[PDB]
């Protein structure tokens, strides 16, 4: 059981707490998890505003049913404006404008998934609730400063460890969606014999017209799930956000 003051305790779902215990353990990388906490404490002591709020840092785990896990989607680091990120890759709180990448994800869903209707909001929590782990590599960011915790925080080693541990030890066969070169680097952590890895170009505008549009990753994900006897994702999102 982690000796951390507060960070491990933010993992509130018991199944995930137990599953992740060998990573949050003090022994993992000889105190690495504690060092992530200490980093976040020091940034706060410096007066830095760190996002998302503590209670959302591990929302990808807390909101995703452990035994129902079937899809893993990787992101880079959280959105960095106030009151925007909430602990799931690509998702934003309601009443926030859609970021460009998310607009493009909605565009592709609209052409790929027959009958999909994009909402005006960007809140993706209903996907997580179905069994889709929406994991950023880096789980915090300083306000307004993209990538600010990527090299300094230690999170990437943690989330790399999570990916490997899921690959090796999750009870279910899983579909990993790897969008862009950063995410695709994680393929080497994943047993592509047991699990299914679907790689595509990233949806941000810089790349989107070079292979994102038309890639049909959402239908491909569902075909993969169906072949593995999983319940497919229900991609339609509530048109009113909670």
Binding residues for Br ion, rule: CB under 5 A, are 99-101
Give least dist CB 136 to ligand URB, A: 5
CA 52 to chain centre: 13
Q: Which of 41, 77, 81, 112 is catalytic?
A: 77
Instruction: Name the binder of 84 from Br ion, ligand URB, none, CB < 5-8 A by kind.
Output: none
* Span from 24-32, 46-54, 73-81, 115-123 in contact with ligand URB (CB under 6 A): 73-81
In Å, how far are 15, 57, 65, 82, 199 from 7, measured between CA atoms? 17, 9, 20, 21, 32
Contacted by 100, from ligand URB, Br ion, none: CB < 5 to 8 Å by type: Br ion
Dist. CA 187–CA 185, nearest whole Å: 6
Determine the 3-state secondary structure of 216 from DSSP: coil
| Single residue of 4, 24, 63, 76 touching ligand URB by CB under 6 A | 76
CB of 78 to ligand URB, least distance (A): 5
46, 108 Cβ separation under 8 angstroms: no
Active site residue 77: yes
Q: Does 153 bind ligand URB (CB under 6 A)?
A: no
| Residues 202-221, mask of contacts with ligand URB (x by CB under 6 A) | --x-----------------
Pairing verdict, β 50-51 and 141-142: antiparallel
Q: What residues act catalytically?
A: 77
Q: Under the rule (CB under 6 A), what is the footprint of ligand URB? A: 75-76, 78-79, 89-90, 101, 136, 204
């Amino acid at each position: 059981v982690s000796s951390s003051r507060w960070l491990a305790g933010l993992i509130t779902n018991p199944e995930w707490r137990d599953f992740l215990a060998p990573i949050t353990a003090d022994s993992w990388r000889k105190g690495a998890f504690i060092r992530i906490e200490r980093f976040l404490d020091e940034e706060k002591e410096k007066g830095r505003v760190i996002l998302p709020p503590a209670a959302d840092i591990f929302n990808a785990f807390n909101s995703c049913p452990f035994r129902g896990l079937k899809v893993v989607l990787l992101g880079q680091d959280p959105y960095h404006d106030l009151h925007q990120a909430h602990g799931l890759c690509f998702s934003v709180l309601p009443e926030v404008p859609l970021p460009p990448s998310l607009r493009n994800i909605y565009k592709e869903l609209t052409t790929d998934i027959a009958g999909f209707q994009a909402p005006k909001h960007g809140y993706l929590q209903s996907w997580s609730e179905q069994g889709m782990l929406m994991l950023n590599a880096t789980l915090t960011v300083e306000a307004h400063k993209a990538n600010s915790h990527s090299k300094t925080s230690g999170w990437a080693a943690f989330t790399d460890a999570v990916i490997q541990h899921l690959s090796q030890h999750h009870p279910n066969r899983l579909v990993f969606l790897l969008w862009g070169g950063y995410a695709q680097q994680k393929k080497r952590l994943i047993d592509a014999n047991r699990h299914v890895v679907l790689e595509n170009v990233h949806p941000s505008p810089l790349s989107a017209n070079r292979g994102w549009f038309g890639c049909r990753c959402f239908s491909a994900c569902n075909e993969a799930l169906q072949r593995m006897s999983h319940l497919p994702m229900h991609w339609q999102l509530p048109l009113n956000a909670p």
